[PDB]
């Protein structure tokens, strides 16, 4: 069949997407703003999945596996 697992992206890809959407004043980002309004149905789920991997007192820092738009 045709299933192939999801590609592991570089994390600098997410960092540049985050940094580029710091200030969004163009005719471009007319779609991305509507996506930002659309994600607010999904913000309790993102807060839950962040907060239930709070690291623990015996750990310094842990790497989580995130899924972004």
């Amino acid at each position: 069949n045709l299933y192939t697992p999801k590609a592991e992206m570089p994390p600098e890809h997410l960092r540049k997407i985050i940094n580029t959407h710091s200030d969004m004043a163009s005719k471009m980002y007319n779609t991305d703003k509507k996506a930002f309004l659309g994600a607010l149905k999904y913000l309790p789920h993102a807060i839950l999945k962040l907060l239930e991997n709070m690291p623990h007192p015996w750990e310094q820092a842990k790497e989580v596996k995130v899924l972004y738009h």
């Binding site: 590609a7 592991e8 890809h13 930002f36 309004l37 607010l40 807060i47 999945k49 820092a61 972004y68």
Partner: protein, 49 residues
């Protein structure tokens, strides 16, 4: 809690991230937890503003 069980639904059950994964629009990586927390704070500020 023990007096009233709320008894989960064992059929169809569409989950969220398992169906947000099948799109081409979401992608996947691993980052530090504190970076993910800071990115969520930036995103959640930007949405409400």
């Amino acid at each position: 809690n023990e007096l009233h069980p709320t008894l989960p639904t064992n059929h169809n059950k569409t989950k969220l991230l398992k169906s947000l994964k099948n799109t081409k629009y979401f992608q996947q990586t691993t980052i530090d937890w504190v970076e993910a927390g800071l990115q969520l704070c930036r995103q959640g500020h930007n949405m409400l503003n």
